[PDB]
Amino acid sequence: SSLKSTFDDIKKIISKQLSVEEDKIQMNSNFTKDLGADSLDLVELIMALEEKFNVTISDQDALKINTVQDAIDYIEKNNKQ
Amino acid sequence: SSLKSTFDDIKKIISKQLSVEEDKIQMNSNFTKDLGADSLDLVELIMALEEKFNVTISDQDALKINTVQDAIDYIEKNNKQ
């Protein structure tokens, strides 16, 4: 998919799973440091992304997802084998 | 402690637990993204820091330790109650 639609939905998801304001979400926003996600929020987020984009984010790959950009970069790469 | 001695030892530890070159470690180095630490390397690192500086890094606080600077900033803050 073109990034625009992809970023639109991720933003909508992140704002739904963490209950922060949609417009306070930016490419460089850190999930744990800037958005205040805890252990359980992360699990819920990674799974929300896994269902919307129908991907699988292995625990190895989740270690490298710190920012929204990381989320987008991964989704775009590991959706097409 | 003054940061210099603290940074000296952390560098020595990170280089020991991850087997990367000491000089390739910088303040902004990401543990999982730049240094290639896996799940088990992280556990071993957090515990190595916990024994050298005799602190306790709760799982809540470990979520916010992405870079070497984060490691240093935390150690310096949460060592003096």
Ligand SMILES: *OP(=O)(O)OCC(C)(C)[C@@H](O)C(=O)NCCC(=O)NCCS
């Ligand atoms: O909050 P907590 O320490 O109980 O749990 C944190 C972890 C990283 C174990 C969970 O959030 C978890 O396993 N989530 C699924 C995979 C990740 O989110 N991994 C991110 C590692 S920073």
Ligand SMILES: *OP(=O)(O)OCC(C)(C)[C@@H](O)C(=O)NCCC(=O)NCCS
């Ligand atoms: O590599 P893995 O998914 O099996 O485990 C990753 C976690 C984050 C569960 C461990 O590295 C772990 O719990 N380590 C102790 C606390 C942390 O390192 N937390 C960092 C969260 S990114």
